[PDB]
Design a protein around this ligand. Structure first.
Ligand SMILES: [Mn+2]
Length: 331
């Protein structure tokens, strides 16, 4: 019926393992659909009908040249108080995306279907001091659906996207292979596209990184997982004055960049406690739980009345899989 399993002794490389070119989490990863969600209209505008959020041209210009067109331009961004004006369902889209691409799912593999948020959450377990909980339903088609069950730092983030981009949300549905027996159909919200480079660009707000500070090592590792799960994607980070909240610097990064930042022969000098936040360890952990999960959820299902399961993971990486009520749906 249920199941407990220790996953702390999962195969993985050395915490100190360094390698030059960042690894990849999914192979043959490609976007298979995309869509803008017009909220007031309760509409989904698929693919060629979707309105991609465009990164302002000045910014694209700045990213390319590595300098602003002129002082005026620069002052339209740098120095702006990302605080000014602070005093003021996703599972539905996924299910439509699954319905539109299903006939294209490889029938020889198990496909986990989920919003990017959850895949990231799972890869992070061993790097967090908090635990994990989620629902995983084994659909009649034998695939698996994953679902669920600081106002100011948050606002500066929307404020920054607003300042850099030209009510409505844009989703990218990608497909990638994990195993010889496992694929992922992931839904992810793109912040924007860099028009000059035809590359999604993930906007992040932050205070200058105090590396060697666990909080930032986490953020940087999560950032890496977040973009490295997509087929194409870059980052743009707005660094702000920890005091004024003024946007001090705009810095663009490729996945390689974020990777290097957290995988040096030098950085791995200080001893760690979370596998030193090593992207490769993360990658190994990735390969391990999903194999574990796919196997057991499949096994338990054949012997149960419930297609849905409560999946939990200890701070000790101990997996717990008990069946959920067959008379309840998580929307
Ligand atoms: Mn963002």
């Amino acid at each position: 019926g249920s199941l407990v399993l220790s996953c702390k002794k999962f195969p993985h490389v050395s915490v100190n393992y360094v390698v030059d070119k960042t690894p990849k989490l999914l192979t043959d990863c490609k976007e298979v659909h995309n869509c803008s969600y017009i909220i007031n209209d309760a509409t989904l505008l698929w693919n060629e009908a979707s309105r991609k959020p465009r990164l302002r041209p000045e910014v694209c210009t700045y990213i390319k040249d590595s300098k602003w067109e002129n002082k005026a331009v620069k002052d339209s961004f740098i120095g702006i108080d990302l605080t000014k004006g602070y005093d003021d369902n996703s599972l539905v889209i996924l299910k439509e995306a699954y319905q539109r691409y299903e006939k294209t799912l490889n029938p020889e593999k198990t496909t986990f279907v989920s919003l990017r948020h959850h895949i990231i959450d799972i890869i992070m377990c061993p790097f967090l001091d908090e635990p994990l909980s989620l629902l995983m339903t084994v659909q009649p088609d034998k695939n698996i659906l994953i679902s669920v069950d600081n106002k100011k730092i948050c606002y500066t983030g929307f404020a920054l996207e607003d300042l850099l981009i030209e009510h409505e949300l844009y989703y990218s549905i990608v497909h990638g292979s994990l195993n010889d027996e496992i694929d992922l159909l992931i839904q992810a919200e793109m912040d924007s596209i860099n028009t000059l480079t035809d590359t999604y660009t993930e906007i992040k707000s932050s205070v200058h990184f105090k590396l060697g500070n666990t909080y930032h090592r986490r953020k940087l590792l999560r950032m890496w997982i977040q973009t490295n799960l997509l087929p194409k994607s870059d980052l743009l980070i707005g660094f702000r004055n920890s005091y004024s909240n003024e946007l001090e610097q705009l810095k663009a990064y490729k996945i390689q960049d974020i990777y290097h930042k957290i995988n040096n022969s030098s950085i791995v000098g200080k001893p760690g406690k979370f596998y030193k936040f090593n992207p490769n360890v993360a990658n190994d952990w990735f390969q391990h739980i999903f194999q574990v999960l796919k196997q057991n959820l499949l096994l338990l299902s054949q012997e149960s009345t419930s297609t849905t399961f409560k999946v939990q993971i200890d701070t000790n990486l101990t997996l717990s899989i008990s069946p959920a009520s067959q008379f309840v749906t998580a929307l």
